[model samples]
Target chain A: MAQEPPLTLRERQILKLVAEGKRNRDIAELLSISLKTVETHRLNLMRKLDAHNAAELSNWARRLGVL
Target chain B: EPPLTLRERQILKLVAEGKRNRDIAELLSISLKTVETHRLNLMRKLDAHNAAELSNWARRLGVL
Candidate 1:
């Protein structure tokens, strides 16, 4: 079976926004979530994708064609 | 400027291409630990704090 890439829809959505240069606070405002919630989502996505920082995460976002 | 060894440069290119440590180790026939070490060393030498910074440096330095 082909395993699904390990991100929730929200995480993927946040990932794309982040890659597009949205700050955590901006994302939180756009998504109507709390700042801490966005931070947690970002951190979780980083851990799942093995991305160390926003730049690395952005690279993945680009590679995955989300950006 | 400190020059990168051939292996480090190779690793940097691979990293900028978005290869993970395990992926690079498999491709280069090196241990994952070794790849990690090379990555850390590259980050220090290039003053790149993350993969994207490293990737940009790779582009700027003509390594990619």
Candidate 2:
């Protein structure tokens, strides 16, 4: 497929939270990390997938078989 | 699982709320250097080239 590749373990975890519609604060709380860290991870995932927006990211995640 | 350090996650939560680094430092009672470091580390980990990309990623990741 021309879609993005599979996510790293951490990326998969983060992506699962995103698919569940969790906010950064919520994810941070659930994962017990800082919101900044969540944001950072999110940014990294987007860059890795070349996704420009959240909706695109979600779509990409599904394509990558992470969702 | 060696998740984000306490301070790092704290900084991110604040950033998600649209808080600037300086404001985050103030809110968390941490040094500006610490906040900057966390932000730098965050970008590095996320592979974000800059703050704009970071912001866009955060929105996409549902951080905001």
Winning model by TM-score = 1
TM-score of each: 0.37, 0.35
C-alpha lDDT of residue A48 in model 2: 70
Please name the candidate that would achieve the greatest lDDT relative to the true structure. 1
TM-score for the second chain in candidate 2?
0.59
What lDDT tens digits, residue by residue, belong to model 2 across residues A13-64? 9999999999899999999989999999998887776543444555545454
Candidate 1: TM-score, chain B only: 0.69
Clashing residue pairs in candidate 2 (N, C-alpha, C atoms within 3 angstroms): A34-B9, A34-B10, A35-B9, A35-B12, A35-B13, A36-B12, A36-B13, A44-B46, A54-B60
- DockQ metric for all predictions: 0.04, 0.04
lDDT of all predictions, in order shown?
A: 0.76, 0.71
Assess the local accuracy of residue A51 in candidate 1 as a C-alpha lDDT between 0 and 100: 30
Model 1 whole-model lDDT (C-alpha atoms): 0.76
| Residue-level lDDT for A61 in candidate 2 | 50
lDDT of 1 by residue, B2-62 (tens): 5688988899899999999999999999899999999989877765334455566556544
What's the alpha carbon RMSD for model 2? 20.3
